[PDB]
Amino acid sequence: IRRFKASKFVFDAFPDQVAIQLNDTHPALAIPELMRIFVDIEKLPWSKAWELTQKTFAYTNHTVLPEAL
Amino acid sequence: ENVAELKKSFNRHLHFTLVKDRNVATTRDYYFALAHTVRDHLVGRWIRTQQHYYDKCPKRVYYLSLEFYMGRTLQNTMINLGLQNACDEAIYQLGLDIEELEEIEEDAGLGNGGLGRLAACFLDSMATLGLAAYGYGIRYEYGIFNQKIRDGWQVEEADDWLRYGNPWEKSRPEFMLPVHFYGKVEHTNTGTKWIDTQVVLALPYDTPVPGYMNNTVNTMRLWSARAPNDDYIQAVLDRNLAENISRVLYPNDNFFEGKELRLKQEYFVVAATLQDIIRRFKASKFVFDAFPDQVAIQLNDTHPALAIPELMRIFVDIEKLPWSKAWELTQKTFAYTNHTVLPEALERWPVDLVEKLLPRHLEIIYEINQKHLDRIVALFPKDVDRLRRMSLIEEEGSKRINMAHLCIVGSHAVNGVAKIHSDIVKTKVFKDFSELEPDKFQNKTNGITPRRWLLLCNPGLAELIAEKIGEDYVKDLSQLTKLHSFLGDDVFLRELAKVKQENKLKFSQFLETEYKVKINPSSMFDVQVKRIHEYKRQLLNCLHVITMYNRIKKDPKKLFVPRTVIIGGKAAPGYHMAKMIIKLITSVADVVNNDPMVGSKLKVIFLENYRVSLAEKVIPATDLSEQISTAGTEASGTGNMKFMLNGALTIGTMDGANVEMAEEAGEENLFIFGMRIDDVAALDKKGYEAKEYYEALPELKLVIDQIDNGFFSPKQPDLFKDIINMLFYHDRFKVFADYEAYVKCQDKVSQLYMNPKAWNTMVLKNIAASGKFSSDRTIKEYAQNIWNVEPSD
Amino acid sequence: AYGYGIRYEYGIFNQKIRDGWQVEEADDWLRYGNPWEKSRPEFMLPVHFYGKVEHTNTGTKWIDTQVVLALPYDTPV
Amino acid sequence: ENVAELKKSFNRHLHFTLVKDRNVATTRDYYFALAHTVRDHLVGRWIRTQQHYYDKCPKRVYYLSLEFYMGRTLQNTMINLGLQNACDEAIYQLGLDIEELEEIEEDAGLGNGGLGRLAACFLDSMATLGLAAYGYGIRYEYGIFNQKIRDGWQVEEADDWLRYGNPWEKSRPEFMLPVHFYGKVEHTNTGTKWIDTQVVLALPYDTPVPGYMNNTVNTMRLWSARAPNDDYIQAVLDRNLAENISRVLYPNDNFFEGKELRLKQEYFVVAATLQDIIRRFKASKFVFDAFPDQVAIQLNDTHPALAIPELMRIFVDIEKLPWSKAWELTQKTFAYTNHTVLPEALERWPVDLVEKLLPRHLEIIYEINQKHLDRIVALFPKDVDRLRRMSLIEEEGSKRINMAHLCIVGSHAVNGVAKIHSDIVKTKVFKDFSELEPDKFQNKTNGITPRRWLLLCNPGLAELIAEKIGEDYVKDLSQLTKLHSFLGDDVFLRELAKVKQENKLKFSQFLETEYKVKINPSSMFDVQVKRIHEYKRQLLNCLHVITMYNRIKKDPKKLFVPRTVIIGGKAAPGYHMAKMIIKLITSVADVVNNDPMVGSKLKVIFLENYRVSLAEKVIPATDLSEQISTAGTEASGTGNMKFMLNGALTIGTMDGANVEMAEEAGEENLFIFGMRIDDVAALDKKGYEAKEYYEALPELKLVIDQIDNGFFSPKQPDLFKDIINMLFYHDRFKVFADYEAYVKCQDKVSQLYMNPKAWNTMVLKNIAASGKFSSDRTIKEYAQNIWNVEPSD
Ligand SMILES: O=C(N[C@@H](Cc1ccccc1)C(=O)N1CC(C(=O)O)C1)c1cc2cc(Cl)ccc2[nH]1
Ligand SMILES: O=C(N[C@@H](Cc1ccccc1)C(=O)N1CC(C(=O)O)C1)c1cc2cc(Cl)ccc2[nH]1
Ligand SMILES: O=C(N[C@@H](Cc1ccccc1)C(=O)N1CC(C(=O)O)C1)c1cc2cc(Cl)ccc2[nH]1
Ligand SMILES: *Cc1c(COP(=O)(O)O)cnc(C)c1O
Ligand SMILES: *Cc1c(COP(=O)(O)O)cnc(C)c1O
Ligand SMILES: CC(=O)N[C@@H]1O[C@H](CO)[C@@H](O)[C@H](O)[C@H]1O
Ligand SMILES: CC(=O)N[C@@H]1O[C@H](CO)[C@@H](O)[C@H](O)[C@H]1O
Ligand SMILES: O=c1[nH]c(=O)c2[nH]c(=O)[nH]c2[nH]1
Ligand SMILES: O=c1[nH]c(=O)c2[nH]c(=O)[nH]c2[nH]1
């Protein structure tokens, strides 16, 4: 986010400048953390924030083993 | 209050309230639809807040002022209600631009400058602190005139601010009140009667004052004059005469014009206010002995001085209280704020005018004075000249009333608005009164609201700060000192400088589209915006500008830090020197901006129609804040505080609050220069001979000769004759006396500017020390040491 | 593209076999220094843990948290 | 090493070493680029110097200490390599400010005070004298805590000095060594074995110690603890436990805390050092009979006392030498320096702790003691109490080891650090040992390096002196006596006073930007900086300050020489009285600095985070040096020497080296006052009753009552109760006993200060007599009378 703000780029264009790949579910907390930042800090409305969040993140599933979940 | 619902409310208002669809709606229609959409969010809490004051009856504060320099309301409201981001989204989804809709709104320019803006910041701080406070003023049909520049001169255009409607005001018919003028007095055996008077009705209009994120919404009650209903045509037309009382704001800043109409406005606002206050007290679920414990009235300068004898009139003539008791409750009710020490600004109404217009008030004033002098004659039997000095009456020829003296004896507290100022008020100007009553005189350093002057005008900065230290600073600005932790944080300094840069680009766009000039976005934005005054000296600034131009003309290739020098402000209509100085600046700018040799090195702009909404644009884009009044002339200043809070460095004198800014941030972190108060005094005694400096300083001589010989006005070589004459023979603000130190200081500023890291480090030290200057702290001190009221957090 | 992860002081353990069984040893890979990483001190950030939620009229805030700084190290790819 | 080439190297490092360009580089990046640019200049001579020691095998000196209070390295290195002026030019041409880059560097605060700073000065003098000397210590991850003042109290913050990297240190992997703890002992037929121990690795880090202008660069080797590599997660985390051994410096100055972790650090540094020393000896192109002729190990106090039984362990258990021979070579190898005589500072480790942690060392210590007492029983058959007094073991209840006794019998020389101190050590504290061995006890008066404490910290002075008498004084400070020739040289006295003035302005700028206070640049800078101790008495000083404030409050117009009183220093974290005294001083300063009546007459500052780099700033700006310990308590002192060398006059007691300063400069040229050693003794016998002075001295009573009644702590009237209680009933440093003489002395100081010519003449007499106090002279005496080593000039 700091790098986005410093760029020559609101946040509307955030997903057009940023793509974050979630390698397995280990960094899953990144979804609610981005929301927390957008909402609690940046004061964006939930709807707007959630839309941006989905466009930013992509999730890669690496396993179906129950003990790995 | 979510995005989907705001769009729906917006569409609903556009339809039912503006009678439009998306095809025929105008931009004004959209602004109004949004204004109403936002306004509906205030209602619930406005009713609850005023209802809660009645039930719990906390002591109320009444801020009585002839001025409330409010600026625009839409954005401020969205921010304090936490609605801005959602509204921004809604409007965007509707395919509109909220910032464009915002520009449709007229400023409620019901003030001249600092005095009026202080009142406005105070209402915001009081609602944010949760105090049961009310602002009482006049609903002028025309505010401070709109300023146009024609052929380099200021031209005034009427500010018809209500032409299209004010969604932010609410008519309160049920509270209309009659105000009396002229007539005669009768001292009957049933009390004294003020009869055969002319009557003018006062219709009150309430505007909500939302606190910052706290459910509190207070009230600003502004009175409008209306002719009462008991050649026919002429008789109906003449109803205009009574209605002229609230027609227009007197456009004088720090200057007393003793016009009868002004006196009428003063009693109008005072009579309506006090009667409304007493009415509410009497309806409160509270004899009058408890009045002072339920009511505090702050006099914003001496303009509402008549409130003192009006309260006594009400208590004695109406409520039938004995003089002694009335007097006691009166002093305990009023507190007075002195905002100036310039001779020409002192309110001294001729006795004959007051006798004709307000006969009962003159009588009461004479009584007040009599009981006043009798006590002095007692304590100081011999000192006859002391009685002359402390009298509410000046008998020297044309007998007049000294309103400040009346405010002093009728109030339990008197305060100045900056330490140095309050000191001079207590120990010099009013020595005889403070020696007699030590504890009466206080200081209450001015402040500015960090909502309007930070959150609103510079969101990029408010956001950057919040990311580093949280949002607590909004409601407790002293929290900005934590910023000190980042003085060696390189990345933060870069982020800080980026915010200033973006503000500069945004405003450079405003300049280029509003004026011819091409702006060097990287040049230093050197700014001086405030009312035009000889004491504020934009003239000194103009000398520095001409000086820089000549340096360029001589050494075109010398390494020069490029500047965009901006100077703006309104001159009172009848203030000749002020109007001449404006013409000088525009003339200078025309030469500078069009000389091929300087080009992008130096651009000069006379910012037109300086007002609250324009201050919000230029202040955040400023690098260097000009606060150069002659030591002893600016009681406090507040524009100086706005620039400090927004990342500009200050070049100024040790005057007003500039002194406390230096104390908080460290003197080395401000570009202080010139004569201090003692130097001015000493130079006075010796006698000030302007010629010396002129002869003694070569760069100054060239400047002076150029202005004098027509260099800056070829077609009228002697155009600036009056300026030259005043400068050499009648300058009581010692312009030439600070020229040298001022120019030397300016060079040091340019030096530092070449060092971005050093420059931004000092900026950070200023921002981090600006906390004292929040009006929330000023109001806390007023609540605690004068009004004796408590918040609700 | 950028890779973002954690700079563990100890990576996956070094495995040894004792009496036929696996035995683990700490992979102290930074002991002698890593010329391939570049500390980026100016980008250190605070990270919050624990604490509580406060639902205010100013907007829900996470307060009384424990803080841990995050110092980034860039390795070229 | 010329300007053009330094800029190129700087740019090269910024690029390849810091991966930056001028646009994105931070100030820290610039500091690092310069540090590396300078560092490269050391390499060639560091390799040659260490190579030359191996080829020529001169006897080596090993200075073993748990402390090395080094301060910053950049400037010191530039100066000793003659690179400063060129680097200053280079950086300036690059558009940077070298002094700003210098401030980025963290102090290597690996010490508490004098003991640690003495070691640091010694390394500089030894490299400058060209001796084959090595400093051996611990590479603490955290040095002496950073001190913050919050609400007037000291708060400690971790000194994470390595966070951003230390370019001045070099990892030496190939010399890692294992250190053993715990375990058990086995006396087998192949020698005794220390088995089943816990192992912690010691990784050595070398820092270069450049001599002043001589091509010599010695080494400071500091050991860092690392867990060896043969719930998994917890097992990996637990590696922290071994690594905690070198985690942090124990923050006690002159106080013994018998914590097991401290004992671990002590054996850690001793085991790694001696094994490294023996390894080098065995690889030298030298049987062990020649060991003592090739190695000298100086024990900096008793902290590394375990080195004695460790060397014996190595010789006996490892090298298989017979006890008798091992013992002989051991005594000839070690020399011990006693740095204190305060009871609470004595190291007395409980036998049980040593048995558990170092079983083999306990055994060896018992043997040492046995052979020790058997010899005494022989020479003195009857004296049973003599054996009790000279035993290495204290059996009185909780049995513990007297480390000083172990250092005395295991060393061939024992020295104190000031004549008066060494006398007391020899004739009182260790009488039984010196009577038994006269020639073993010596004196070696402390000294300070004139590079860091003159050339570096006060270039203006070093330059002024050099212009008068040349530069030879740098390497032979006794050359300063030539300055005597200028005692009647008026122009020189003016030049001397100008240097002090400039230092004062420079530091006044530091004060104003760091603290609120406005500094009177012309006032007398009265300074007391050193660790906070009851025996050092900044409390007495505080009484004098309050005294001066009261005098001002009474006679506001009396001619008073204005002063800026500065008191700073860290208090050990668990030292309650020390922390209370700090709070007292800050409380006093807040009243004084904000009382309108005193104003610019008196300002008080509690200098925060006093450390080496800050001593370099304040010392050169000092007029009056406070060295007021109670006679008999300060073994020597060295801060006293720094002030003398830098142009301050001294007000102190006849204690430690203050006595020799008086001898060198003439007693009349120092403001000596109070009880001398004999007076303290006499007052002891009689019994000290604090009340007498309190009742007997009116100015003291007012001071005391004020502190006691809350005058200096309104909101907590009883806050200073403990201070008051200690003062009347438990003050073993007789504060009230010297109050009178102290205040009388202070007045004489102010008297002289009014006489600029008389004042500067005495200053010159102090500077001219400061030559004895160079650590180069101290090291010459150590080399000649103890280590038996020779230089290389
Ligand atoms: O005045 C109406 N809406 C209002 C809406 C409004 C109210 C307050 C401020 C701005 C706009 C209106 O357009 N104005 C009040 C202003 C004035 O007093 O000049 C301008 C309105 C809506 C409507 C709808 C029907 Cl069907 C008939 C008459 C109507 N008047
Ligand atoms: O640490 C130096 N060079 C570095 C070189 C290096 C850097 C990165 C990885 C491996 C090696 C060094 O030896 N190490 C960093 C590693 C660690 O963090 O432990 C080991 C160095 C060079 C030098 C030269 C002088 Cl004159 C004085 C001190 C010095 N230190
Ligand atoms: O660590 C590098 N330079 C070093 C340079 C340095 C060395 C010693 C002290 C201070 C600075 C560095 O920046 N630091 C070592 C410190 C630490 O251990 O935290 C910080 C470095 C340069 C470089 C260049 C490339 Cl292309 C890739 C990786 C790199 N690392
Ligand atoms: C704040 C403000 C002022 C007062 O500014 P000074 O520089 O203190 O005189 C005047 N006019 C406007 C529009 C302002 O916002
Ligand atoms: C020299 C020095 C000391 C020792 O000073 P004394 O006044 O002799 O106790 C302590 N701390 C620092 C930082 C020093 O430089
Ligand atoms: C009469 C009048 O308008 N006085 C003005 O009041 C404001 C608010 O106190 C001051 O900041 C300013 O210096 C002063 O000129
Ligand atoms: C235990 C200890 O730190 N002793 C200190 O050692 C230094 C260096 O010898 C002396 O100058 C000082 O007076 C003394 O207090
Ligand atoms: O009409 C005036 N208005 C002013 O504000 C002013 N100030 C001043 O000096 N003269 C005048 N005149
Ligand atoms: O924890 C302490 N450290 C000290 O340095 C000291 N000195 C002292 O007298 N008591 C204490 N306590």
Burial class of residue D423 (count of CB atoms within 10 Å of its CB; 0-12, 13-18, 19+): middle
Find all residues with CB under 8 Å of D307, minimum gap 6, and list them. Answer: D64, D270, D273, D274, D297, D299, D334
Residues in B touching A46 (Cβ below 8 Å)? 2
Find all residues with CB under 8 Å of A8, minimum gap 6, and list them. Answer: none
Same domain, D178 and D32: yes
Annotated binding site of B: 21-23, 54, 279
Helices and strands (DSSP H and E) totals, chain A = 4, 2
Phi/psi at B520 (5° precision):
-80, 105
Count of alpha carbons within 13 angstroms of residue D654, beta-carbon side = 15
Chain A nearest-CA distance from C59, in A, is 7
Q: Does residue D259 have an active-site annotation?
A: no
Chain D nearest-CA distance from C41, in A, is 7
Catalytic residue among D564, D638, D653, D778, which?
A: D638
Catalytic residue among D117, D531, D603, D734, which?
A: D531
Nearest CB to C26: which of D19, D173, D236? D236
Write the DSSP assignment of D131-176 as a string of letters.
--EEEEEE--SB-SPEEEEETTEEEEE---TTTT--TT-EE-GGG-
Q: Which ligand is closest to the CA of B571, given by its number?
A: 8
Burial class of residue D579 (count of CB atoms within 10 Å of its CB; 0-12, 13-18, 19+): middle
Q: Which domain holds residue D690?
A: 448-774
Residues in D touching C38 (Cβ below 8 Å)? 19
Selected residue of C10, C13, C31, C44 to mutate for chain D interface (largest D Cβ count, 10 A): C31
Which residue in D213, D244, D183 sits closest to D78, CA to CA? D213
Q: Is C39 in Cβ contact with D28 (below 8 Å)?
A: no
Catalytic residue among D313, D339, D452, D765, which?
A: D339
Q: Which two tokens stand for residue B117?
A: 């803006």
**Residues B89 and B154 sit within 8 Å (Cβ to Cβ):** no
Q: Is A45 in Cβ contact with B85 (below 8 Å)?
A: yes
Q: After which residues is chain D broken (C to N over 2.5 A)?
A: 230, 286
Q: Using N-to-C axis directions, what is the helix angle for B756-769 and B658-665, rounded to 10°?
A: 110
CA distances from B198 to B139, B222, B615 (A): 21, 21, 42
Count of alpha carbons within 13 angstroms of residue D406, beta-carbon side = 31
CB atoms closer than 10 angstroms to residue D178: 14
Distance (Å) from CA C39 to ligand 3 centroid: 6
Residues in A touching C47 (Cβ below 8 Å)? none
Torsion on CA atoms D719, D723, D724, D727, rounded to nearest 10: 180
- Report the residue among B112, B156, B252, B726 best suited for mutation to probe ligand 8: largest number of ligand atoms under 8 A from its CB: B252
Same domain, D397 and D491: no
Q: Is B86 in Cβ contact with A45 (below 8 Å)?
A: yes
Q: Does residue D513 have an active-site annotation?
A: no
Q: Which two tokens stand for residue B469?
A: 């230290």
Q: Does residue B12 have an active-site annotation?
A: no
Nearest CB to C42: which of B213, B471, B490? B490
Q: Which ligand is closest to the CA of D14, given by its number?
A: 3
Q: Which two tokens stand for residue B244?
A: 């002229």
Whole-angstrom distance, CA of residue D358 vs CA of residue A24: 51
Q: Is the dihedral of CA B278, B280, B283, B288 positive or negative?
A: negative
Same domain, D196 and D148: yes
Distance (Å) from CA B516 to ligand 4 centroid: 26
Count of alpha carbons within 13 angstroms of residue D357, beta-carbon side = 18
**Residues B669 and B625 sit within 8 Å (Cβ to Cβ):** no
Residues A1-31: b if buried by 16+ CB within 10 A, e if exposed: eeeeeeeeeebeebbeebebebeeeebeeeb
Angle in degrees, CA B588, B593, B596, rounded to 5: 120
Distance (Å) from CA D208 to ligand 2 centroid: 13
Nearest CB to A43: which of C43, C59, C62? C59
Which residue in D60, D82, D110 sits closest to D218, CA to CA? D60
- Report the residue among D74, D171, D224 best suited for mutation to probe ligand 2: largest number of ligand atoms under 8 A from its CB: D171
Q: Is D513 in Cβ contact with B666 (below 8 Å)?
A: yes
Residues B341-361: b if buried by 16+ CB within 10 A, e if exposed: bbeeeebbbbbebbeebbbbb
Could you tell me the end-to-end alpha-carbon distance of chain B, in angstroms, rounded to an integer? 23
Torsion on CA atoms B756, B762, B768, B769, rounded to nearest 10: -160
Same domain, B401 and B482: no
Q: Which ligand is closest to the CA of B106, given by its number?
A: 1
Question: Can you list the positions of beta strands (E) in B189-342?
Answer: 191-195, 198-210, 217-226, 295-300, 334-337
Distance (Å) from CA C36 to ligand 3 centroid: 9
Closest approach atom of ligand 4 to CA B616: 15
Q: Does residue B172 have an active-site annotation?
A: no
Pocket around ligand 4 at a 6 A CB cut-off: B 113-114, 117, 530, 610-612, 615, 637-640, 642
CA distances from B212 to B79, B126, B216 (A): 8, 10, 8
Residues in A touching C61 (Cβ below 8 Å)? 40
Same domain, B437 and B539: no
Nearest CB to B491: which of C42, C56, C61? C42
Residues in A touching C62 (Cβ below 8 Å)? 36, 40
Q: Is C31 in Cβ contact with D165 (below 8 Å)?
A: no
- CATH at residue B784: 3.40.50.2000
CA B745 to chain centre: 28
Chain C nearest-CA distance from B615, in A, is 27
One-letter identity of residue B658: N
> Mapped to the 3 state alphabet, what secondary structure does B62-90 carry?
EEECCCEEEECCHHHHHHHCCCHHHHHHH
CA distances from D174 to C26, D180, D268, D556 (A): 20, 19, 18, 70
Whole-angstrom distance, CA of residue D791 vs CA of residue D136: 20
Task: Give the residue carrying structure tokens 């007539």.
Answer: B183
Q: Does residue D516 have an active-site annotation?
A: no
Whole-angstrom distance, CA of residue D680 vs CA of residue D672: 15
One-letter identity of residue C31: R
Distance (Å) from CA B535 to ligand 8 centroid: 12
> Mapped to the 3 state alphabet, what secondary structure does D167-234 carry?
CCCEECHHHCEEEEECCEEEEEECEEEEECCEEEEEEEEEEEEECCCCCCEEEEEEEEEECCCCCHHH
Task: Give the residue carrying structure tokens 């207590």.
Answer: B426
Whole-angstrom distance, CA of residue D620 vs CA of residue D759: 16
Q: Which ligand is closest to the CA of B256, given by its number?
A: 8
Q: Using N-to-C axis directions, what is the helix angle for B721-729 and B698-709, rounded to 10°?
A: 140
Selected residue of B423, B484, B490 to mutate for chain D interface (largest D Cβ count, 10 A): B490
Closest approach atom of ligand 6 to CA B301: 1
**Total tally of structural domains belonging to chain B:** 2
Three-class DSSP category at B652: strand
Same domain, D763 and D643: yes
Same domain, D340 and D472: no
Same domain, D577 and D617: yes
CB atoms closer than 10 angstroms to residue B17: 15
Same domain, D410 and D543: no
Which residue in D525, D514, D772, D507 sits closest to D648, CA to CA? D525
Long-range contacts of D437-442 (CB under 8 A, 24+ apart): D440/D408, D440/D411, D440/D412, D440/D413, D440/D414, D441/D413, D441/D414, D441/D415, D441/D416, D442/D413, D442/D414, D442/D415, D442/D416, D442/D785, D442/D786
Find all residues with CB under 8 Å of B683, minimum gap 6, and list them. Answer: B675, B734, B737
Q: Which two tokens stand for residue D67?
A: 């402390």
Selected residue of B471, B476, B479 to mutate for chain C interface (largest C Cβ count, 10 A): B471
Selected residue of A43, A44, A50 to mutate for chain B interface (largest B Cβ count, 10 A): A43
Q: Using N-to-C axis directions, what is the helix angle for B698-709 and B538-554, rounded to 10°?
A: 100
Same domain, D480 and D351: no
Nearest CB to B3: which of A41, A42, A48? A48
Nearest CB to C41: which of D164, D171, D203? D164
Whole-angstrom distance, CA of residue D602 vs CA of residue D689: 32
Same domain, D419 and D540: no
Q: What is the DSSP letter of B189?
A: B
Same domain, D425 and D571: no
Whole-angstrom distance, CA of residue B58 vs CA of residue D178: 76
Burial class of residue D460 (count of CB atoms within 10 Å of its CB; 0-12, 13-18, 19+): middle
Q: Does residue D772 have an active-site annotation?
A: no
Catalytic residue among B642, B734, B765, B777, which?
A: B642
- Specify the resolution in Å: 2.1
Residue D113 Cβ inside 6 Å of ligand 5? The answer reads: yes
Regarding beta strands C73-74 and C38-39, do their DSSP bridges make them parallel or antiparallel, or are they unpaired?
Answer: antiparallel
